[PDB]
């Protein structure tokens, strides 16, 4: 229900999110005895 036309142009790109899985080095092991 409109008396005016809308035209679908390129969607404004959202702020770029990325899926870079962050890898964390494990804690140091305690002094091996």
């Amino acid at each position: 229900m409109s008396r005016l036309i809308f035209e679908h142009q390129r969607r404004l790109t959202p702020p770029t999110t990325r899926k870079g899985t962050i890898t964390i080095e494990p804690p140091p092991q305690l002094p091996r005895v």
Binding site: E25, P27, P28
Partner: protein, 81 residues
Amino acid sequence: FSSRTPVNENPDGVQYRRGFVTRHQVSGWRFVMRRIASGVALHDTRMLVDPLRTQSRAVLTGALILVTGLVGCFIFSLFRP
């Protein structure tokens, strides 16, 4: 084990200004200074042997012998009658 320091990717994080001097930093500075001194006085930068550090160590050993003999004869004067 862990020794790293990844790149900070957060612009809203904390930036550590006004650094101190670490033990590592002062050792590295003393090394590069002895290296410049060797490269200037001698024409060595390979640093296999550093006669300048040996000479400085020798004079300081003389000073240590001095102060040691001093305090030794001092306590000798005190303890003995």
